[PDB]
DNA sequence: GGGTATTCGCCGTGTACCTCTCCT
RNA sequence: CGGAGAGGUA
DNA sequence: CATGACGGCGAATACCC
């Protein structure tokens, strides 16, 4: 069933796989992350509440005084988004926190409070996220990019040889807290454990164990299994468990019940061991010298002499063992040791370990932490306690503890945030047994080891940093301040918190200037995941492995959309259905397969759990009952793909677009494109500039509507109703009676954005797509945004294209464009630039903005007003004065139009400092703003009054009908007349009460709005006045501009061909664009061909419908043909029944389809070639997609058929107008007299090292010399060269370059005598 | 453009040997001692 | 941009280039180890001139 | 001058300052740095004259 | 086995693509070099190679894991038929590897070029003939059967 | 000197961190405090602390970060010291001495000019007007159209027709240097004769694109104006594209046709079994061209054509031999552009990229530079035309 | 008293161009 | 008009 | 404080006589 609005233009869908899970809200990550940050959390797990609870209470050094946090609240922002953008201020809310100052009684028993002060304190401004996941910082729209970082926890790694000798792998373990120092253990080439705290000098690991109050005997017990030698009389017989002796050769003739089983020289095998199941021999005699290679595991003394015979971890020698035995010791402790699986790493580290007790270990650790500073016992103990065992300085987060326990196979997810002795011991044990070949190292690039921090988490972290900065000051203010009667506001200072928050939101690497070329660019920016930033990677240093597509990226990270160049593999795009779990790990949805039936139950699996299941591929055929029709389905099991039976299968992919991102999901026939060109096309879709008229893609994927709606660039109906009013700037919806709340007018007003510049100086314009009286439903698009057509993303234009060479004008990706494309303004775009004229204070006097400018004629000042500011609507060109300003010396400092920037003045804004007389232009602009504001509080009032009047009319004729009093008694009398109350007006007392409140709401804030309009807005220090002029320019398509499709097929226009010269078909229709076939084969982006064919088919359908519209055919014939068109396909999922439509709806649909029927071809469930040929037949077009073309220049037939179709082309934001630049002479740099750099500075081109090498290779010595001297920092040479050129003398007189003198002076400044010699 | 047990003659011609020492063999087929 | 200045130093100061740029020029000339000269230079030890 | 302009400027300049090295403007890099004609191609003959006069 | 199958598919595709059948003036059917557009582009040398044509119309073939090991099951589809989700995801590994390889090797190439330029910057032809009788002996480069 | 360490104004009234004056400030401060704590006298420990921190200030000013931690400014960024002035990629040597920004330079997006000759480039007239501006001033005063510099500047700003005539006169034979980054070898800079074009994009000759590793999917190139007579003659005699047809790395030709030209020559030189006009006998290439253009014969028809070819003798003169060749119509048509002295068999085959490159190399070896340049231009034109017609 | 193997600190890591914000 | 951060083009 | 880079090389360090 289709709604009335959907009936306008139904895109034909060739998708065959049924859609089980809807595409989620594409901006969920940002909104949810910030909502976690700012919303009240009673549990205190996350957000501002957690940040406060993690630092509060703060207590004095004595502890007599303290602060207790009670609660927090966010106030109403002073300005909303629009005023913040206009005034260039941050859109933020005030943070108001309820604090309590507890002063405790002196000489009291315990913690008794003498007094409590309850106050509310302002702790700064928290920037607020907008409705579309953006932030307004200093008036600029910014996106906080999510960061992919190593999860906190324990991670076991190794370097596969490639460090020392040959093949020696050194295992290591890293405990990474979310907050605190990093604890590393590693194996050296000598198989000794070493410990590193914060990448400092490595120490023996045993020191840490000593620092944990573990003696040598305790350590050896922890990390070794005790073997016993129990001597009765002699012969050194030894008790053992059989499993111990497996692996090594036989040192003695092992005896079984008095009978020898294996003699010397034969290695013990598995059968040898299994023969002792019924042979439980315990005491076994061994040779005396066999003890030589053994280590004693305990501390021993002689019974009463007091002379310790030995200590733990000592080699047992013949003299040692013998004189031990003569002392009557019945048994001796030893360490079980092997060579391959029970290596004595701990014992050898003990040997190396220079410390001998807890104090020595503490001193060594303090020495390593504090190099060169004297150690103290108390200081060392405090430092070691603070390193990993204090909540204030160390914190494993909840995810950190979870990952820590998971890696150690602990069945408790929840735990403390600080390390314990057991945690460190278990980490050491797992590292040791990984060395022993029992475990496996972790994959660093595995998405189960890399998590996502978003805007909320990072904002909370920066807030906590600011809060601890406040804590340091407040603790000393409470301790060393003889406080009495003081309030908690006195101690609290909001400067550090505000500074930290502004630094994060304006200067962080992940706080990025929003890419706002088109809605797709906004969506992609809001969905990017960055491996860079603090705690991440650097693009100069990242290796191949981290940049690669990892198998766990499936369904979580797009393997296609990533930047080219240095940022490749480091910046990624979230997949369509991907989301983060509670721990920040990316998870993707799957359909549960139960008993061979693919159910509709959806489970979101993370990378760790996904590898434990067999998941069927999305392209797997099912039936009505859900069983797999085939018996060997392709599946992914453990990062590998193979075939399984249906019973083996556990899960299935929810969609064929699950793996790709939004931009990749917008590419039709993506499966026929090479991945490199698909990457290029997905990247360039974001660079498309919105054109004069939004044009739907004839060939789409079906994702256009979702992108357009979720981007927020369109006006979407909050509630259903009927269009009560509509004009190019506003839409007024009369809400349906079933969607209105009690006591409201039920009017929805949508004010449209009109011709505002984007972050990239493109035009943001909303125009309504609904008519007067149209019925609208909730979620309906009311106004199209930029690059949006009837709620569908429309990045470019549909172009009739032929694939053929045309006289070299399509050579090397060049594009030939017909002049009709220029005439029809298909790719003409609006660009809005903001120019600022600032009048300041100078040492001499204030700068004056006036129309009296010296040394200019009256003709040059005709476009200015009396104040000296350009009129609205004035057509200006390069050099024209916009704002006349004179700086005293007076000198001409007036703001002029940049060269070749001819445009129209569409807006002028004046900002005046307080105490400054605003000019008459400012006065009239203020008057216009006041009038518009008065209209805003009246026209909105009038419309809401109309809605309330309609509501009161509806209610009053329901049980209280009074026809006469409708006309003989006016509205106001009802409100107050003295009569007995009844059912007639009691209900009106609740619905006209809101009417009276609008008498108390719109008028009450009128004074506030006037005050805001007339207030002198604060400006930069020394700024008297700012005049902002907005210049709007139409950029028409021209040679040098960059065009591209969605398939990576990019090019630069080489010629604007006249229409009579362009290739044309038998009907005389010329093509719009000629593309080179030669760029198809090697690129292997075959989709652009198929789309072309499909595009033709689409146009063909329109070409029929349009015909039936011009011949005024019956609605029945159009019904039949359109039904045939929608029914075409090989068992497509879409079903469109035109019989349900009315005749008017069918006519409207046919009108919307007469320019071509839109086609939806999903990225991996798209139209087949046979379906495309069927659609070509339906439009009476050749199945090959190739037609006979004629040469416009001569009329001659091209000898072979040419692929002619429709391609959806984009104009990229790489216009030749912005790139063309030239300079003869200009300004120069200060330190070096070389020309400035950059087109914006009118700079010169850099002749770098390689250009100099090329000139040297040519032998062009004079050209090189003139580049080095007279075109550069040779001031005298360049002046003389200019004078000679003006005199017609092309001869240079080179001197010494100034930068060489700068180098000489700089080397002198280093105390080095460098000079030129005599001659 | 850059990245990152027996011998059988295949053609017709005479075979020359350099740095060679020849001595008596069991089968008459020379063994290299050089 | 051509006239230089000078700063009179209360005490002699060791040029960093002739000390730390390996091999140490002061160290090689005086046959002392770099660590020793550094301790003396940055006030951690004495030298029996 | 060439070695300092290539790499390890600190070490090369320390060597040169201690040794008191003298640098003849003989190569291409040296003449490029001082903005002279290179001893190659059309400037080659020029340097020849500069050699013969000296 | 899969490499042999890929070779067979490639041979069949090229044999079918490189020839067309034409009627003579005597009404006989005769074979000739194909006038297929893509075959003409490859045969002329203007654009494309046999390997790319095989990806277009044969099978993409065996792919490699990011670690460099070859995936057991090759991509049996071609760009005309269209890949499935798994095949495309597998191919993204090689695509990303190649692009990252280019991006990171360009810097090493530039550094090597700068070092070579410095080491050879001062060398100039300064004489007509020094008169030396020495020289290097040039012979053909021979490695096994082929020269 | 202070002018080598200036203070850049920000927002009109305030200065940013110079990052070098801060180190000097610290050294001066520490030196003065040391000297003053040496006059009043103090416990030796604090005197030695002040001496040590003066040492640290001086060694940070000379080489910040070489020994110990790197002193940090307002931001976490390390301070940039005197040693950093002269070392590294951003140091004085590599950033201002071995390479530098130059005047009389511009840059723009490049498009293909298929009509250009090998020695010509398409240059925007706006770009040329900006680049050659002193020459315009000189000529305007030369014919007394502007008495002073100011009048000439105003005339150029107004863009009068006479100023465009001056621009036409100036650049008649004055070459310009085109460069595309990266300049991997010397052919990345080549000299061309500018031809004024109305657009904003530079038109590049197809054949030199391989030399530049350039295409037309967004590439941009820089243009430079040789000022002096020596530079102009170095551009004409050394760096002009006509002199750079061979590769310095291996000696092979580098202006070899590719893509559309190769496809056009291959298509025109292919033969078909029963093409229209097969079995005809033609007086020469002109008759073949007439038959093809009038539609009476296919381009791939196998025919007999009277071909007159020329061969250099021992003396070096061109001896002419005329004979009937079994060839195609397209091969006979292509024969017209072949310079005298080449065997007819060089075109009597389907011509691929290898064959076309061999044709150009043979032309260069036998006949020299000028016939080679003419032949390359003719090959490019013919290839484009017949690729379009195909 | 001497030689040799291992450790540690320094050096280096493509060119050209374009846009934005922020910086005592 | 210098430095830093972010992004982008070839 | 940052804790995700690594290969090459020379001076110094330690071990082994
Ligand atoms: Mg390119």
Residue numbers in the entry:
A (entry chain F): 2 to 890, 913 to 1342
B (entry chain G): 929 to 932, 948 to 977
C (entry chain G): 99 to 147
D (entry chain G): 1320 to 1373
E (entry chain G): 685 to 831
F (entry chain G): 246 to 635
From the paper:
The structural alignment centered on the core of RNAP indicated very similar conformations, with an overall root mean squared deviation (r.m.s.d.) for the main chain atoms of 0.23 Å. This movement, however, does not appear to translate into conformational changes in the catalytic site, as exemplified by negligible differences in the bridge helices (0.54 degrees and 0.16 Å) and almost identical interactions with the nucleic acid scaffold.
Here we present structural, biochemical and genetic evidence that ppGpp controls Escherichia coli RNA polymerase (RNAP) during elongation via a specific site that is nonfunctional during initiation. Here, we dissected the effect of ppGpp on elongating RNAP by determining high-resolution cryo-EM structures of the E. coli transcription elongation complex (EC) and uncoupling functions of ppGpp in stringent response and genome integrity at the molecular level. To visualize the binding of ppGpp to elongating RNAP, we conducted cryo-EM studies on a ppGpp-bound EC, consisting of the five-subunit E. coli RNAP (α2ββ′ω) bound to a nucleic acid scaffold mimicking a transcription bubble.
